[PDB]
Amino acid sequence: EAPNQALLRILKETEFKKIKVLGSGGTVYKGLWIPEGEKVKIPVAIKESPKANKEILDEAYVMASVDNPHVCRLLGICLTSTVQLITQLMPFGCLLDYVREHKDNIGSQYLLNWCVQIAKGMNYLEDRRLVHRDLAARNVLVKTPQHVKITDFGLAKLLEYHAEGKVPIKWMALESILHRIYTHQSDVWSYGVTVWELMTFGSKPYDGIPASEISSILEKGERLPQPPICTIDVYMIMVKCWMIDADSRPKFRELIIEFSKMARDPQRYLVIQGDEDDVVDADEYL
Ligand SMILES: *CCC(=O)Nc1cc(Nc2ncc(Cl)c(Nc3ccc4ccccc4c3)n2)c(OC)cc1N(C)CCN(C)C
């Protein structure tokens, strides 16, 4: 492989301010990163034992090694006690909560554009030989309603397959459930489930079915149902992401092309009723 010359930035605790809690259950805070002597305020998210410190530094390693407009930005780490992961603040939350809270106001243009942007981010990760292993609507953050990015690389592995603990069964490819193989094509399966989440405005996949039953359901040939707004063109793409033969599933490069074609005439492919001073974003602080 090539030498990973990415830079790991160490940030002083004295450079962070206005810290409020965004969510917990670790904890994630919202705040402002003010680099000393820079006249710049960066809206940031701050994610917070030896085992906890090892895993958070693994995610810091991954996020420092990726740079793409549709992959979340790592700004640095802070070595205060428990290691803190400092990333770009995405002020509209995760896509899962966003489609649930704004169902009655999301048109076909936004849905298909999100599918394009997620596929662009995953295609970049594939270029970097990175398998996400946890692609889901909850792990796609919203910078603006027109710009989303993939997040949460706690399970990501650099690669061929990966052989592996606890995992999101209802988003995993069948070969990942049965024999624990993870590939870029197993990520494609998760992409199909993620699209199904968006097209259903936040429904839970296999709602009410225990995770221990998912592998037997998938082996029988059963899949997630066709969402009401989805034409057969869109649902066919999702079904192709859920093929048994991993090499028969679409490639991320191909998902970009197909969803971009659809985004040029979105109402032909999604049928939705009523469809007709010194603050600097991290994307501009290079
Ligand atoms: C799906 C939950 C969620 O993402 N909520 C959220 C997120 C942000 N913005 C943001 N920006 C960057 C990063 Cl790294 C994060 N990280 C994060 C991960 C997991 C998580 C779980 C629960 C709550 C927050 C959270 C954050 N997040 C944001 O910016 C304003 C707001 C929200 N909220 C408040 C959605 C509502 N909340 C889930 C109750």
Swiss-Prot record:
Changing residue 13 to K: Found in a lung cancer sample. Residues 16-270 form the Protein kinase domain. It is found in: Cell membrane; Endoplasmic reticulum membrane; Golgi apparatus membrane; Nucleus membrane. Changing residue 65 to I: Found in a lung cancer sample; constitutively activated kinase with higher levels of basal autophosphorylation; more sensitive to gefitinib than wild-type. Changing residue 8 to A: Abolishes phosphorylation. Changing residue 158 to Q: Found in a lung cancer sample; constitutively activated kinase with higher levels of basal autophosphorylation; more sensitive to gefitinib than wild-type. Phosphorylated on Tyr residues in response to EGF. Dephosphorylation by PTPRJ prevents endocytosis and stabilizes the receptor at the plasma membrane. Dephosphorylated by PTPN1 and PTPN2. Monoubiquitinated and polyubiquitinated upon EGF stimulation; which does not affect tyrosine kinase activity or signaling capacity but may play a role in lysosomal targeting. Polyubiquitin linkage is mainly through 'Lys-63', but linkage through 'Lys-48', 'Lys-11' and 'Lys-29' also occurs. Deubiquitination by OTUD7B prevents degradation. Ubiquitinated by RNF115 and RNF126. Ubiquitinated by ZNRF1 or CBL at different lysines in response to EGF stimulation; leading to recruitment of the ESCRT machinery and subsequent degradation in the lysosomes. Changing residue 9 to A: Abolishes phosphorylation. Changing residue 132 to L: Found in a lung cancer sample; more sensitive to gefitinib than wild-type. Changing residue 131 to L: Found in a lung cancer sample. Changing residue 87 to M: Found in a lung cancer sample; increased kinase activity. Changing residue 13 to A: Found in a lung cancer sample; more sensitive to gefitinib than wild-type. The record marks 285 as: Important for interaction with PIK3C2B. Changing residue 285 to F: 50% decrease in interaction with PIK3C2B. 65% decrease in interaction with PIK3C2B. Abolishes interaction with PIK3C2B. Ubiquitously expressed. Isoform 2 is also expressed in ovarian cancers. Changing residue 135 to V: Found in a lung cancer sample; more sensitive to gefitinib than wild-type. The modification Phosphotyrosine is found at residues 161, 285. The active site is at residue 134. Binding of the ligand triggers homo- and/or heterodimerization of the receptor triggering its autophosphorylation. Heterodimer with ERBB2. Forms a complex with CCDC88A/GIV (via SH2-like regions) and GNAI3 which leads to enhanced EGFR signaling and triggering of cell migration; binding to CCDC88A requires autophosphorylation of the EGFR C-terminal region, and ligand stimulation is required for recruitment of GNAI3 to the complex. Interacts with ERRFI1; inhibits dimerization of the kinase domain and autophosphorylation. Part of a complex with ERBB2 and either PIK3C2A or PIK3C2B. Receptor tyrosine kinase binding ligands of the EGF family and activating several signaling cascades to convert extracellular cues into appropriate cellular responses. Known ligands include EGF, TGFA/TGF-alpha, AREG, epigen/EPGN, BTC/betacellulin, epiregulin/EREG and HBEGF/heparin-binding EGF. Ligand binding triggers receptor homo- and/or heterodimerization and autophosphorylation on key cytoplasmic residues. The phosphorylated receptor recruits adapter proteins like GRB2 which in turn activates complex downstream signaling cascades. Isoform 2 may act as an antagonist of EGF action. Belongs to the protein kinase superfamily. Tyr protein kinase family. EGF receptor subfamily. This is Epidermal growth factor receptor.
